[model samples]
Target: MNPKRIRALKSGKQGDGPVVYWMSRDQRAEDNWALLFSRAIAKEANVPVVVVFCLTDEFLEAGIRQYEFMLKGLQELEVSLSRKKIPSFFLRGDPGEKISRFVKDYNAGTLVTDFSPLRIKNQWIEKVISGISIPFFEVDAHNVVPCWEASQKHEYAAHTFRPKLYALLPEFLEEFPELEPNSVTPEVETLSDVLETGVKALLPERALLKNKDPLFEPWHFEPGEKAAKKVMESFIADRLDSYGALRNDPTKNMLSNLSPYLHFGQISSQRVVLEVEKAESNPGSKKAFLDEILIWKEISDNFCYYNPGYDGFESFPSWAKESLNAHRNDVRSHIYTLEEFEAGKTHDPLWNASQMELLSTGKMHGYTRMYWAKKILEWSESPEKALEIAICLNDRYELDGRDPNGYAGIAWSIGGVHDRAWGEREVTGKIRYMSYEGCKRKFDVKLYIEKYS
Candidate 1:
């Protein structure tokens, strides 16, 4: 562990039956610093470690499809933990309330949890911290370099943040510590019983089962720690070499489809970083992966930290806001309602297809996502309005939607956040604009149009 990054208060007042590892962001049993840290605490206390997850029905942008994917993964996680003599429990309700209740009920001495930077997640932590009297420790297991520890103030942009991140990478990139499970096994209710009862009571009566129809067809995403590891290995072995050239090409499956997994905390960024560093045989491949993980991912966090209203139009820098506001009423050649966009009925087949892919599969290629959002701005009433529509649609549908990256990416395209102005255009003003023709010049637009159409 990097000595610069403080391991927020880990000890609690004397007596304890088990150390509670509130499994929120980091979901996997392995390659998780938070979980490993919890085990270390448990062993030191001479008690078992118990994992708890609280399910909420109110997670924005997460619907039945997202829930199904997570539940399946949790089911697998329970079995894996059982083999290691750790008991995992799932509860249904507001996490903040549920976690406090569990901490009180178990009389847990130490409460270790993974870090999350989102407003909702921070709210949950605030509630737990304010309500609980016990020692509450937060582990920075999400980012390879701890977000708070890396900088005292919010970073300006990737350019400003990149150097600081690189300086700390060597120290923070040390191998994950070996974790040994505690000898004692705490008595806990069966995962099946808990899930069955929770689902029956908490989930809507019409909720779909694990592998049911529409949900399964649109998104049959693999979950669990083992599955996540397999994805990393496969991506490194098959795609990492060509990732630099082919990632931008939507037709090629060169980009690692690891965003959803990372968003769900099914895998650790550390694990991904470690594997990439080890497997990358060439400089080009290493450079490409570094750009994605360091520059892209770090910028997402940077945006969230500096621009609190990152999801809102006001989050744009002054010039972008003024320029876009100046051109608010510029007439669009083809204006389509949100419904039409969602239904993939726009005049532009390429834009429609990309939207359709995101709608049906809950994911879109990185390059296509950029084109898709930019087109929305060009066709909408105002750039600000387009930003709203695009973000709302994305947050409501995509499983990995409402993430920091989503907020930052949309803002970058529509509001010019973290981006510079380009030559003045009709509706887009000086903001950088992307065109269907430009994308067509780069990739197989016809293939995408036909595939989704």
Candidate 2:
């Protein structure tokens, strides 16, 4: 890991003991910059690098759907770490408090953690850094071009951020060094002899998570680092050739389908790009795939980093907000309550089908997600209200919800974040318009409906 990728959370006085890494954002045991960096520090000091993860069941708007996916992935992670001869421990509740207490009790020399742009993660990072007495570093293991290195402030749009990211791409986008197998040299008996400190309190107790919610399919998302790699390899091998050409079509399956993996940090976006560039696909298709995974994904992080109002109406561009306000009182063709939308009981069959796709599969196609949010804008009482209902539905059900990309995508769909203004339209104003007729012309809306219905 490069020094530039690691930012010191504390500037002075390095504490002394074993190196402790708090694995939060990036859950994988391999291809992680923070883990590698922590291991490097530990190697120099000749101390064991202990990895700890804090499990919280109360993340905002996240329900059983999100928890199941993350927990399953973490389960695989624990197994992987054990095989690598690294001790991966789990803690329950109040991350900041538990993590700080653990560090103090262990007398950890240095504390390292991975990156996240979301507010809650930042809060945890804040509390941990302040509470702990060790030297701390926040590593951007999630992004190829680390968020802060890419830009220090909120970028207006993709155009503004793309060039900046590409310029730094060559320097930042590099291969990961192998994390060697470890030898445990136990320092203190912190978690030792504590009979109650099993994985039981921190994570789900071995009830193979069945998809009880009939709205979603059980097959699309099998969460874990191993599964993430399998999906990525298969997609690039079988589907990379036509990704750019057919990806926008809702009925097609050419997409990499790695959003859930990326969201949970099960896979590294940088590693994906490295392997993708090695693949033999049409140059255009390769560029398209890289653009989605690297450029757009990084820009989304930039948005959330600086824009505190990212997921709310206040985050919309000035023109978008102005336009939405001007058309606030325009008579809606229809208005549906949040419950009606969640039940997939709207009037438009196309919109209903799109909801069912996300409702049933924990995912909706990229194109359909835009169409879905746009329809919410059309049917809801207000643009602000549409955002609330749509984002709630997304965060509550979508596997990749509560992500920067999720926030950015919804903004683009309903508030014209990166989009150009279109001709004045009902309900949407200057915001880009999407409709059932437009969708019908693009793909087999009926087939999409039938698949989920």
Q: Supply every candidate's count of residue pairs whose N, Cα or C atoms clash at under 3 angstroms.
A: 0, 2
User: TM-scores, in order shown?
Assistant: 0.90, 0.92
Per residue, candidate 2 scores C-alpha lDDT tens digits across 1-453 of 578889888864666677888988888988999999988998898887889988664643355556667877877787788787788778867888888899888888888899888888888888887787678888999999888989988877777888998899889988788898777636422233221233334234221223542445668878999999999999988999999899988888888889899988999999999999888879999989888988789888888888888888898889999999999989999989987888788888878888878777788888889888988899889888888988898987788888889888888888898777789876789998877888888888888888767
Query: Compared with the true structure, what per-residue lDDT tens digits does model 1 show for residues 56-153?
Result: 65643345556656777888888878888898878777877888888888878778888776787777887787767777787877788887767777
**RMSD values, in order shown:** 3.4, 3.9
Query: Residue 426: error of model 1 in Å?
Result: 2.6
For model 2, the superposed segments whose C-alpha errors exceed 4 Å read 185-213
Indicate the residue-level lDDT of 206 in model 2: 21
Candidate 2's clash total is 2
Question: By lDDT, who's the top model here?
Answer: 2
Error of 2 at 452 (Å): 1.1
**Global Cα lDDT for candidate 2:** 0.82
Candidate 1 has its poorest 10 consecutive residues by lDDT at: 207-216
